[PDB]
Symmetry: D2
Subunit: 481 residues, 4 copies
Amino acid sequence: TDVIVVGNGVLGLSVGVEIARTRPDVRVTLLGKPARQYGATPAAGAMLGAFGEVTAHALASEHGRKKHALAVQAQRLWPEWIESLEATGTAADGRIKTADDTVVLLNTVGHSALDDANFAAVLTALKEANAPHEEIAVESVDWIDPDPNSRPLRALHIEGEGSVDSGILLAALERSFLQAGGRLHPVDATEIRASHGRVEGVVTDDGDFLPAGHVVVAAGARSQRLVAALPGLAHRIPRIYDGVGVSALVDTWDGSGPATVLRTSNRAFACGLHLVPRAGGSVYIGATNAVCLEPRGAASIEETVALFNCATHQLHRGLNGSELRKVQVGSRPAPIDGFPLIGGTSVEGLWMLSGTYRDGLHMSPLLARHVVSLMDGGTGVDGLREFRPERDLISAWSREEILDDVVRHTMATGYEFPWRLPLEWPHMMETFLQGPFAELADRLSDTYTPPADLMTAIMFSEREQQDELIAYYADVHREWH
Amino acid sequence: QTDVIVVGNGVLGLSVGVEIARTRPDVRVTLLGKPARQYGATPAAGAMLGAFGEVTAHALASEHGRKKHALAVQAQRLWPEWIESLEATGTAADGRIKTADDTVVLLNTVGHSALDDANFAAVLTALKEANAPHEEIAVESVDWIDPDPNSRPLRALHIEGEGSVDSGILLAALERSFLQAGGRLHPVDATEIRASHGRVEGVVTDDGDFLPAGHVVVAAGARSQRLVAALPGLAHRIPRIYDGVGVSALVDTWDGSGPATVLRTSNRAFACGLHLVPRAGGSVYIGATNAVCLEPRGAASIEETVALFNCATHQLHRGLNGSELRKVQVGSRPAPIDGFPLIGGTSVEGLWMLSGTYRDGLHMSPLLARHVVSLMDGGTGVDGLREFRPERDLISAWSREEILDDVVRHTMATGYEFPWRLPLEWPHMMETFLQGPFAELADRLSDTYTPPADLMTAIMFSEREQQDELIAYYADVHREWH
Amino acid sequence: VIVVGNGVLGLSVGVEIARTRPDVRVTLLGKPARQYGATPAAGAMLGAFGEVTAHALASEHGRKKHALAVQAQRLWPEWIESLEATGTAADGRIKTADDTVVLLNTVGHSALDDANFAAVLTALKEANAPHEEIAVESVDWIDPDPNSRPLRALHIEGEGSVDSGILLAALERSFLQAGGRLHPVDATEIRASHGRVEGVVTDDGDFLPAGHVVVAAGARSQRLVAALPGLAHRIPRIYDGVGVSALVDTWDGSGPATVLRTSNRAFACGLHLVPRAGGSVYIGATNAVCLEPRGAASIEETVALFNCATHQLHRGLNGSELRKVQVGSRPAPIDGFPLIGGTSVEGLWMLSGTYRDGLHMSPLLARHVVSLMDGGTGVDGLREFRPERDLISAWSREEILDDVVRHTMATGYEFPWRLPLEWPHMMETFLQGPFAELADRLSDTYTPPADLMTAIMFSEREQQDELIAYYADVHREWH
Amino acid sequence: QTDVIVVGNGVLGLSVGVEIARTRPDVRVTLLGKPARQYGATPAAGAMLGAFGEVTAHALASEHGRKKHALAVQAQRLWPEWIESLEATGTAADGRIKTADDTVVLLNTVGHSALDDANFAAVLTALKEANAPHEEIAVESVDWIDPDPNSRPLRALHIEGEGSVDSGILLAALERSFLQAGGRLHPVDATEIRASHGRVEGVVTDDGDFLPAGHVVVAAGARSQRLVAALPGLAHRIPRIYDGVGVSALVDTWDGSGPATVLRTSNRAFACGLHLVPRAGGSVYIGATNAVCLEPRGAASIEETVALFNCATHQLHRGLNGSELRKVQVGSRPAPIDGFPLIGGTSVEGLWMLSGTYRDGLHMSPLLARHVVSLMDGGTGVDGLREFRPERDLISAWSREEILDDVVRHTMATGYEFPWRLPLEWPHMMETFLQGPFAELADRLSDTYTPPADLMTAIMFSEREQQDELIAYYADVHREWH
Ligand SMILES: Cc1cc2nc3c(=O)[nH]c(=O)nc-3n(C[C@H](O)[C@H](O)[C@H](O)COP(=O)(O)OP(=O)(O)OC[C@H]3O[C@@H](n4cnc5c(N)ncnc54)[C@H](O)[C@@H]3O)c2cc1C
Ligand SMILES: Cc1cc2nc3c(=O)[nH]c(=O)nc-3n(C[C@H](O)[C@H](O)[C@H](O)COP(=O)(O)OP(=O)(O)OC[C@H]3O[C@@H](n4cnc5c(N)ncnc54)[C@H](O)[C@@H]3O)c2cc1C
């Protein structure tokens, strides 16, 4: 029985590996090119972020608390998953794990309404989960050499929350996939073919047709656009946008690196500052985030400067004199309703693994096992049912909660710069931002409100793009009510 | 009576008092006001004899603004003989009224291009049109200045015969000249003007006394309209005047030096600006902030003092940083609600007004004095003052659209003048989000009247009750004149 | 008895003498103008734990000064009761706050602010003082710029503030009630012969006889006594620690319920707000050691004071009305420690060189000197601070050179500056050599503390050479 | 042999290769170098045809600097025919070498007055002295630019006929023209020049081969002196060349637009500068940082990338902020230790050098190529270039005092160009404390030689062992020539 996995990121390869190992009866073919155009995974550090990803806003919603529980469950799978992938290689392939622990730093280069609230939410989430952690003296954090005006005054050590080399992970997944009898076919899917409510297979961009009983779409930010061509699915699969992220590999001045992940809490519009250790005198610094209504594969000047400025001031001034090896750009799959698209469709044999935004790589072994269990007639992981791909848009927050959040995040872009303004200006800007965002939210839809990250993108998009989204929301409402 | 009472002891009241006393030796002229000069604009002034230095693109884009500028140019011609006539009543030991003959206008980048670049070009054009002597000079040739390099000027304009006076020595010379001409000083305040059968009878003072008069000249600064508005019908016939609260400072320089000229920028956000006026005895005057306040204020805010000092130390001379602060001065520019002065006669026989002169009453004083004295003698005074008669419908010198463009530009200029450091997308975001609220305010205040930018920002950030009282005021004025 | 000086120390000792010796005539000199007066420019904080620095507590002399500050705090409640007792409700309240909050923000050098916050916490724990580290969100009233906000806060119970003006009025009233005489003239000269005080010549030409003269003339105290034979090189010099503060009427008439402060910052300046009655707050306070007196604020001092308060404490102060810029001279002793007690001249006493905390220590210092004048031994730990002494060397030259470079760099971080990231390390490297060369040139044995060392570094060559001569003459006298 | 080997495939090697191949059709010319162009200056260049734009007050204060400037002016005259002759060997699809005809020099306050104001005046003086066509223009008339108002220019200078080329299209045109003239491209590096009996024999390549030749022209950029220094005595007879590491970037503009002219500042701290060179197809070039490194570096630092982008987005066009980064480019300007190029013949028969051209070798290339080809043919080439012969005692173009003033000014300029915000006493404090250490370094390095400011800062912040090796180098040069 033929299975085609569309996409060669962490999610496609993780599901490919689990099918190939688990299902000796199926021939599994994985599509995607070595260039990995718009690929999130190669641009990732990556942090195995569960507690580090906690925000007050996320944990204020039932859907956010459910997503967090799944991130905590995923962390338990990583040690055996890494062992099983390194087992198919040798010493020369390098180590997947680059750090065991994370330090979260609190500095004043940001908004109190995000950074202070989020630091308290991380502490509360760790205490509630009984996770091992300690608030530590900043003086005890090794390696860091911040600008004194940008320095942390509080620090939180999270034990067993670490990082992987995303490049070594991708290489280990491909090697493990081939060892288990998987086939890599380096072309893109152009079209999923279906008739009589069942997948027939995939047309490739070299003109070929590949037959299959099962198609798993794990094409990152392209996943919904690929499935939306099939009858009715345009308004039944929530849209996925590009959360364009910029990161960099730097060769440090002295070849040193920190022993732990160093990070802030999530910041304005789900960007954040972090350093992930790498082998061989390299560090990863990340990572910007901007929701784009169309794909973008190149860094902007603004993104590169903000990333470098935050890292050199808030983490280590020695990075200033360090050599830039690579500016990396990738698209976090940004779901329009703020939650992932994991599981089966109304089309027999059609599955989706996408819309994982900031933490698909961390959740990958859990999500892979879930979808593979479903494909085998199992029930997979409890609590992933709410994130089924064919659904009405989730409304995880009130319009009022989102309007408060989008104004706070807008103001946070100033405080994170950090700006220097006359003291009356911030209050003036807060007062004049409220009305326009309230008017936009009211005009977009009577029922759906986009989360803050997408709402700012819509606010500053062309009138034609806003009108097309008004029509999309109206057609979704029609379909599900 | 043929007795004259001048209400007010600032530059305007004393200047008119001197001109009346010298021109009518047959009549008794009495001047009211106390030596404290509460909220007094004149003692807080440097002061610059600003004509060309006061030019803005926005002012010269209106007919009323061009008329106000023509009068400033005419006033400048009177200053040399006026000063000679005042110093003539004193001796060398009284000190010199004039502290500088010339002005240098500096162009730096610590401000909005839409104000500073437009205003510098407007000053150059106005000087050329008036055939005034001036030269664009090398910045390196400007005497004394030692700016922060990131705050330095890259262009400089020397204006010949546009100078400064010591406002304290001017006030002393005016009082001395007033007494020498037979004027009487009565150091009390007027509480009420008495009139009946369309004619002034005189003035009740705050010690309970009644002083009779055939002529009353109101030059009481920002209190002038409140004083006249008590008389029948005049409450909606005399445009309101608000307090343009200005902060300045006297500094003893580190080495006792000072520049040989006035140093200034063009007028900046909401009619503030940066200037240094030389003084004798190792002192310099630095000014000056401006904020229209709906009620009087007699104390500097922290924000005003810091902005004044920061601009002077960075843009003029870093040596001022180490210099000793002698005095923070606060005074009220009389800020007329329609943006133009109140000069001349009333529907009440013998009642005259000299007020609402905002930034340049001191500069215009010899011209305004001669104008009102000519009118009191049955003359027509100075040509082009007619539009600025005190009993009038509110002037609309600009379109609502021109004022809305100006108030947004001035708001943005408060950022660039700080100077702020922001992400590059933020200024355009703030411009876009400022437009709607200012347009909504303008539309709500009145169908016919629009306050100038300086007052519009004060109204925007005032209490709902103060906005509603202004809506009622505008409606009552409309009723009275239409 | 003649007390020379009408600040907190002179009036406090005057009150204690007049109350304790009703048999003796006590006359207090000084003018209502209080030229260069430290006391009227003070908030004032009853600073014991708030004044703790890592540098101070690293020396034996610094630990002794701190112990005395802790002892002084215990005397304040009864002292205030005894002074308010001589007045009525209409005189106003001396005490303006009971408690202090210390804020830690990043608008400063880690090497000062982080070290000093840890030192304050340690000193509170060691003294068993009641205190709590609190959530910043729980600090009432404050509205900082988010980029200037505190991330840690420390509530110190029973460390409060007084209105310095109401204290001065209460001391004068209490002095008169106890039979003291106020003579509003200055002393020009102390007269002594056969190793004994005869009295004081005043600036109106008069001679006032006395068996006892107590010099509490603030920053003028040593210059006054140095005229007497040999005392020029036996009484440590006192300089002017010129301080700028301000009274502000708040936008809404509100004020905080506690003192709000940082730890001491570059060259012993600091940021604090002291509550006052009637919709006023006190903000302070700058500090610059000047080799000559200065009675006017500089532009730079006024801007630094206002900028720190509006950003780090409350943005609402920006729109608040300036009522008064105050300037006073902290008596800055050349060896960093006060001059308290008796001299080799019989009947000649000194109370001076108290720098940042003479007002706080006043009831303890007053009782000490009055005990000594009565043949007692006063307070146990004050002996090292006797006014007739060789200059104290409380720190190694190396410790002071590290401190002066750290404090110089802290003037940048406290601004706060924005510079290319290589510049701070470049400036640290190029500051070390010149300060080491200055220290080596001034003397083989004495090193001025950082606050005075920066003043000497940027003074005229003639002023440096006069100090080299002074240090050499002191060495001669004592070795 | 009569065979010629050109060692190096940058603008200078290819330009000389083309001129030899075209002028000596009888001889085999082989050009060495790899398509990677490791550390290559030319591919990282915009490039500006900078003659007047490169003028500084410091350069024109020395006789050697005035001679270098005269040669840059002469080179400009050759470019039109040179470009025609190179495009002639291609077709329409190869694209155009010339990307702009004119340059605008902008003066803003994001820099030190002691560099930017002095250099702007020096450019104006040099244009007037040369009778070159130019105009000081209104900043409002400069097309395309959209600066941050706090970073905006207040003066602008239009230089007619001073333009730019696409360095990539130039390199492709030079290779094609070299082949068309009968040149051979051998894509390997030289490891060693072989000579005996005072004559070149040829070149050993890094693939182990030996290539015989009668003539070897070394145009290996910053590697040129290290290659020749192996030959007897030449270690102390050919001035050292260091790496002037430069960072630039190609950006796809938000709307596909670009300016019609080069936009630039005068040269800034340690011979960095801000400029935008137009490119075809919706791309712009922005440059360019400069740091002398004692060892080669092939990667941009974080600091360099941020400074380049921040200056361009604030001072030229805020729209670049939202523009897509296509490429960060890094190349090594050949930085001669005595500040002047190494052009011409050696004491070794058939050995020639074209190197040490720092910021303007690409601009001078057609003149330098014709000069060396004339010398190889027994001519005297171009009149003023004999002073820049490669085998020489180190030039001392400035007094030690002039260089100590310059290095302190340039150090302070790194602050003002950031731009920093500091307490007003700090800059004077840092100036005072920088003077002593730079004077001590200069005194310790040598009794006779002083490195120019750009190299002096690199030496100041290098390891003690690197300083000691330079002291030995200077002593060995002194020994050799005195
Ligand atoms: C800057 C950055 C930092 C990050 N940091 C972290 C981190 O710290 N921790 C963490 O857990 N995660 C991190 N992530 C990643 C995040 O978890 C993502 O949600 C996750 O990588 C998504 O994986 P994916 O396989 O769904 O998508 P991708 O990784 O985008 O993979 C999809 C692949 O499919 C290919 N494709 C597209 N269309 C087709 C088609 N038609 N046919 C075939 N192939 C196609 C694409 O080229 C691509 O290679 C980061 C991402 C970014 C951009
Ligand atoms: C800005 C500032 C803030 C402060 N804040 C605090 C604080 O928070 N807490 C605290 O505890 N303390 C504070 N202090 C004060 C500090 O404690 C001082 O050490 C203390 O006030 C010194 O008091 P004194 O009486 O010795 O001097 P002063 O208060 O200066 O009194 C000396 C008096 O003697 C007079 N005098 C001088 N020469 C003669 C003469 N020849 N004859 C007669 N009279 C003469 C002077 O005019 C003056 O009035 C502050 C001081 C300043 C300047």
